Amino acid sequence: EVLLLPIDHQPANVTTPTLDFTNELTNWRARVCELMKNLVDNQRYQPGWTQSLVSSMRGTLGKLKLIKSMTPMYLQQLAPVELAVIAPMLPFPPFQVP
Amino acid sequence: TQSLVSSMRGTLGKLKLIKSMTPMYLQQLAPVELAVIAPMLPFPPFQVP
Known part of the structure; x- marks a missing residue:
């Protein structure tokens, strides 16, 4: 009952997410x-x-640093939760090396 | 101006850093190819230093 991830995750404290x-x-x-x-x-x-x-x-690099997108916040908060939801109901069970 | x-x-600093294999070839493979070819010539080589 443990699933290893590449990246760091945190639980979303709120339920109205924002940038x-x-x-x-x-x-x-x-x-x-x-x-x-x-x-x-x-x-x-x-x-x-x-x-x-x-x-x-x-100017282009200064704007690419500050471009807004919810995808890294998604990967650190919501994506591991739904991976842990999906992972039992699966015909081929997870198989991981550390 | x-x-x-x-x-x-910029043109000079890029033309310095152009990636061509010809100076590598002229020191590594062209002398051994000349040494391969040179005995089988009808006019055999004639050199002054």
């Missing part, structure tokens, strides 16, 4: 965006570009 |  960012996959998306922002300001790299391209690329 | 020197630096 938040304290979230492991949101942290992951933010760190990838911060790496690419640190990539596009380099003395070996930015003189290869124009100025408007630097400005537009930094 | 501006935005010409920048694109020139």
Whole structure:
């Protein structure tokens, strides 16, 4: 009676869900965006570009960090609950290595 | 002007980092292929240093 998961989960405290960012996959998306922002300001790299391209690329990365989507909150709150609901009524029982 | 020197630096910095196998070939496989071919030539090789 235990099911191992790749990611971290937490129980949803409320039942009217709403957008938040304290979230492991949101942290992951933010760190990838911060790496690419640190990539596009380099003395070996930015003189290869124009100025408007630097400005537009930094704007696009700053908006991809702050794009809203309930999917990481879904994966950390609701998806393991319904996987645990589905998993008994199943013709092939779960088979996991750690 | 501006935005010409920048694109020139980008073109040069990319053309340095182009991925071509020809300098690898000329030092690893072209000498052993010349050494393979060279005895079976009707005009055998004639070299000054």
